[PDB]
Design a protein around this ligand. Structure first.
Ligand SMILES: Nc1ncnc2c1ncn2[C@@H]1O[C@H](COP(=O)(O)OP(=O)(O)OP(O)(O)=S)[C@@H](O)[C@H]1O
Ligand SMILES: Nc1ncnc2c1ncn2[C@@H]1O[C@H](COP(=O)(O)OP(=O)(O)OP(O)(O)=S)[C@@H](O)[C@H]1O
Ligand SMILES: [Mg+2]
Ligand SMILES: [Mg+2]
Lengths: 528, 183, 183, 528
């Protein structure tokens, strides 16, 4: 009842009841909880990775994956906290049976969340990092906050070299802006919008998609813990998405910028009514094409403040950025430190797999552990007319394909359902009609469908094309709930096929489940 | 269970088939046309594989070389006018040599080459092609042919012996689990 | 008298003629055939120059690009089957960029590029082509076209405005001295 | 009459008479003459760049171009030397009016040869080197010499990296073997054969040709002072030549080796009778293709002793060579030092131009200063039959050509007259017959004409093709004397066109002559 330890620190009466923990603290004390838990400040005030919770607040669920930096919790004078066990976490845990990578990512104890004490936890291969922060970061955030409180909805543009802290900083900034409650009698929470323009390792969307998200609650979880927010009191909702079909925006810069314009446009419309700050995080390019892109982005958006997380970056990139910034005649440009294993590739892959296992519908988002193979696929028709077919055709990005090959190439990959809003989209393509072959929409140029008239409606994994009968059909499985799928008349719905990085995890998944619980699997060569 | 290697081709038969198409001589007017046709189909197939993701470097190299050779011996208003052919060849060689050297690296170009067993001639040809005055058609032609035979010894020969009804939820009473891809 | 520069072309008219053939649009069914034919002849001519010895790098680059473009848009059993075209394009770009960067050197690739005025896109395309997975046909096509226009601005536009009687000793009474080459 | 000075040294009675110098020396003394002179030891013994002259000897002409290292002359006890002025040197001097490069290459005084005294000579931009030699070099040479005197005709293979001393060493070795006269009562001089397999900077042939030379007199002059020895008491004669048509043997290794075989074969035949040592100098490659070539050459020739002029060469080349050497089961392999402006390109060019100005007849070879343009060309017919035409056709090496282009491409370059010995040469080519167009012999493969049945008969410079009449003809000018040209029936004579490095000097030559003595010159763009 006085637990003291290097990483964490002192405490007081620790009352275990029904599976939850009621812990009292009479003095400033820091904890480092690990796992899945819920916080509900009973009395006093606590800070969690940028947010501040007081007695008048709802339960906040926190996911602390052993991968990233465990959020630190700091409690202030005369406080009583109640730590609840998260329910939906159980489903996520079971995902370890479908991929060993998801196994070592939480506490290997009994309960759902385990406290730590310098080393009494953190099983083998600990590598247990911790979320820290230079005083500079905090000071700058404070400045931005106070300035905001006396002006309209600011726009903060965050950029910098790879592995610099752009994401983490964004996280802190967002939470602070939302939760601040400086002194205007809590005004409970100011909504906040996040514009994600990073196809590489996205936040609030599966890899390969750009999007605009609206947050009502603090963001206290990694990307692979909510990669598919509900489409359409609604803690996090997605306003619009666009498919780039590549893990590198260096395949069609024009398209990338066009997407940025459309999304920002929507933000403008929404902002016009209620004041809502926008936080945008850019990719991680600082030379060549990328640098040019950044310059253009700054010009288009006209960000109020540009934050470069380097402080020792190459003179070339810094100079270029400063010039672009100067051009819009008035934009503050500041620099911050950086503070510099799970490689980006694996992390990205995890995001994708998590997305596909998202259940079609508390607190967050439930998960379904049943392997993809077992699930029943969606049977789409490929023989009729553009009113009794379902899919209007298949378009290819950045690369064509001979007719015959298409069947084999498409099969097994990830594609995107794109909904046509205005017919002024396919204006310039030989759209197949009544019509056995796949209704391929020839696209000589190669440019992707315009972003002004088309919107992404989630990704699709194809599990088998069988066009050898008198009923051509496609078996595809997606996370999109049936409600949305049925409401589309089939006449406005095309499938986009690009890169996406072949979902290799899918094939193996079945085998893992079968073996763990304890035969010509295409594309998998078993070594024996 | 790290014994899972992923390949772009569905199974093994497909890979062997492609091998056969590329090298009719070892695997074994109208006949010539047939052979040429098959080679073209093989090249296209490999291209698809490349896009799919994950592909042995040797396969890509072989595809490039064969494509160039086919372009060279094409009569009928379309023989590239001589300069294009020389360019295709140069590109193929550059990619091939760069790949081999880059792979088996921890030295100098020639040292690594000797270690692998790659005749220095190829390294020199590559260097020359990149920096100065693309080589003459004759040299490229002969070199390409030799390259193919070498690749055969180094890789291919070891792959085996030589002999609103638009969306309807699938009936939850007729479905049977089966690997992703099979129908 | 170090004011003597040697050129592979006999005089100036020939160079201008080649320029005209390469860029009909600026210099200005049957007409299309004519234009294509002339372009081919120009490419061949440049090839000869290259062999002769001494030739502005820009001319060689232009020739390569045009040759590739011609190969790409050739119908009639001989359109290289798609992979060859992509190779020709890659080779042309590699040579072009390597030349420009090497010339204006004393830095980094991108730094030199920026200094010269070469859009970074080209440098990136070159790098990508050499090391990994030759780019897609569409990108190469558009890039090549842009490259040609740029080259026009950088070089071509400045070359002028735009409007046993087997062996008999020659009679030492009828011969008149005259430069080597004229007859 | 006692002239003393740092570089040179003491002397005695210096009698000037009729234009020559009779100088007496009572003690060992070294001189460094510059220019063109003749030596005739009256009494005593003198050494000159490797040779030794005694009273019983004929006048020896020495050319000391200011470019290379001036040969040093060392006189022994009680000697009287008579220095004569060279005659033919006058013609060579006048060549300065056709190329400023030939201007600064001798003494800018009055007479033909000027002595030196540390700095009293050597006009502006002196850079006056001097021929030296590590004692090791001399010791090794001595060893080889004594060994030779007790065995048959040795074969010495000299190789090493660029700018190492292969050529200079060869020079010394040849002179010593020839002149030695150890103690067998002078046996006046042993003939010596030199096999030149270096197309780059050749010795005893114009650039681009391989050849076998026979020397009766000591070799005391640079390459561009006898690039075209007489074909067929005959101080230096050429036994056989072959055209490679490139300044780099890296265009057809097979051909290069084939040539080596043929030439060596002839050497074998000649050697069989009279004992005559052979000195072969190889190119300057030490990595990749070149290294392989060297290995093969060692195998084919089976040299008695291999001399590598590096002593610190890369372990790769040294190891490779040692292995190859070991393979022939018994070959001594030794290493020597190296002792490390006129670039190879310019030197080579000079050689070529000198060749073309050679007079058709150490003492040596006369030169004709008249510019090439003025000379009357050889009119060869291109319309008749293979018995009344002259040239049997035109063959291209390593590169083809469209018919039309050929006329322009050939014109103005340097090609080679190849004489067909046996009709088993053009066996595999579509030889044109009776037949306006140039009789081009299509050669799809590209390989050069076999060396077994074809021999080079000097190079040819074309000065104008005019096939627009009713008498197609070619105006070409060469150094080959008329006697040889007429004796060929025209049915066995083909022109080979390869690289050769376009003779740019030719075009300008006319202009220089005209201006110095004091209009649409093709290929020359005058800057004004
Ligand atoms: N102050 C800090 N406190 C805790 N972890 C930090 C801190 N600074 C950096 N890190 C670590 O740095 C890593 C990268 O953090 P990010 O904010 O994702 O950087 P990033 O620039 O977004 O990386 P990319 O380019 O997006 S892959 C994380 O794993 C963090 O654990
Ligand atoms: N001992 C020496 N005495 C005088 N000059 C020397 C000596 N050693 C080297 N040199 C100089 O070195 C230069 C090169 O001499 P070479 O014998 O031609 O070497 P090399 O290896 O034949 O050069 P390459 O490869 O043939 S161009 C000459 O200009 C000589 O003046
Ligand atoms: Mg990030
Ligand atoms: Mg030499």
């Amino acid at each position: 009842m006085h637990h003291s330890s290097f990483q964490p620190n002192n405490s007081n009466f620790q009352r275990k009841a029904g599976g939850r923990l009621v812990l009292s603290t009479p003095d400033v004390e820091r904890f480092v909880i690990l796992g899945n838990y819920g916080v509900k400040v009973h009395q006093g005030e606590v800070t969690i990775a940028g947010a501040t919770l007081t007695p008048i607040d709802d339960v906040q669920w926190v996911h602390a994956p052993h991968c990233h930096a465990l959020p630190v919790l700091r409690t202030a004078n005369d406080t009583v906290i109640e730590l609840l066990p998260c329910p939906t976490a159980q489903g996520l845990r079971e995902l370890a049976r479908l991929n060993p990578l998801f196994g070592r990512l939480w506490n290997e104890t009994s309960d759902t969340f385990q406290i730590i004490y310098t080393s009494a936890d953190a099983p083998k291969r600990t590598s247990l990092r911790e979320l820290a922060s230079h005083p500079a970061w905090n000071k700058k955030i404070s400045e931005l906050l106070t300035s905001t409180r006396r002006k309209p909805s600011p726009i903060l543009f965050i950029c910098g070299p790879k592995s610099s802290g752009k994401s983490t900083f964004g996280r802190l900034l967002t939470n602070r802006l939302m939760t601040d409650r400086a002194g205007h009698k809590s005004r409970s929470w100011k909504p906040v919008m996040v514009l994600d323009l990073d196809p590489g390792q996205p936040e609030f969307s599966p890899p390969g998609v750009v999007s605009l998200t609206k947050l009502r609650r603090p963001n206290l979880a990694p990307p692979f813990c909510h990669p598919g927010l509900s489409f359409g009191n609604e803690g996090m909702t997605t306003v619009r998405m666009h498919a780039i079909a590549s893990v590198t925006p260096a395949l069609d810069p024009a398209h990338f910028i066009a997407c940025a314009r459309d999304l920002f446009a929507y933000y403008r419309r929404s902002a016009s009514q209620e004041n809502i700050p926008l936080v945008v995080n850019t990719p991680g390019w600082i030379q060549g094409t990328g640098l040019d892109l950044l310059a253009e982005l700054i010009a288009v958006l006209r960000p109020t403040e540009v934050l470069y997380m380097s402080e020792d970056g190459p003179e070339e990139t810094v100079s270029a950025l400063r010039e672009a910034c100067a051009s819009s005649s008035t934009i503050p440009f500041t620099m911050l430190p950086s503070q510099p294993s799970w490689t980006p590739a694996t992390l990205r892959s995890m995001a994708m797999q998590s997305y596909f296992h998202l259940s079609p519908f508390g607190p967050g988002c439930e998960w379904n552990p049943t392997p993809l193979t077992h699930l029943c696929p969606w049977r789409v028709r490929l023989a009729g007319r553009p009113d009794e077919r379902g899919v209007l055709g298949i378009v290819c990005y950045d690369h064509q394909y001979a007719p015959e090959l298409v069947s084999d190439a498409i099969n097994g990959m990830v594609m995107g359902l794109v909904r046509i809003e205005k017919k002024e989209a396919l204006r310039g393509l030989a759209v197949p009609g009544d019509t056995p072959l796949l209704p391929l929409i020839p696209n000589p140029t190669g440019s992707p469908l315009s972003p002004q008239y088309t919107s992404l409606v989630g990704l699709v994994l194809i599990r088998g094309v069988s066009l050898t009968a008198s009923n051509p059909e496609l078996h595809l499985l997606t996370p999109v709930p049936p409600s949305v799928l049925h409401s589309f008349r089939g006449d406005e719905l095309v499938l986009v096929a690009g890169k996406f990085d072949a979902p290799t995890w899918a094939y193996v998944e079945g085998l893992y489940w079968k073996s763990n619980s304890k035969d010509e699997v295409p594309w998998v060569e078993m070594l024996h | 269970m790290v014994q899972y290697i992923f390949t772009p081709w569905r199974n093994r038969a497909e890979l062997l088939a492609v091998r056969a198409q590329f090298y009719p001589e070892h695997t074994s007017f109208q006949d010539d046309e047939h052979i040429r046709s098959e080679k073209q189909k093989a090249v296209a197939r490999v291209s698809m594989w490349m896009q799919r993701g994950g592909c042995p470097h040797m396969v890509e190299s072989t595809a490039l070389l064969v494509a160039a050779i086919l372009s060279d011996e094409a009569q009928g208003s379309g023989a590239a006018g001589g300069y294009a052919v020389r360019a295709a060849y140069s590109a193929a060689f550059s990619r091939f040599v760069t790949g081999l050297l880059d792979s088996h690296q921890d030295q100098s170009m020639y040292d690594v080459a000797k270690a692998v067993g790659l005749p220095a001639a190829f390294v020199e040809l590559r260097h020359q092609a990149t920096h100065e005055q693309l080589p003459s058609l004759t040299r490229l032609r002969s070199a390409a042919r030799r390259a193919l035979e070498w690749i055969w010894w180094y890789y291919w020969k070891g792959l085996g012996p030589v002999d609103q009804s638009g969306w309807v939820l699938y009936d939850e009473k007729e479905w049977v689990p089966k690997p992703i891809g099979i129908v």
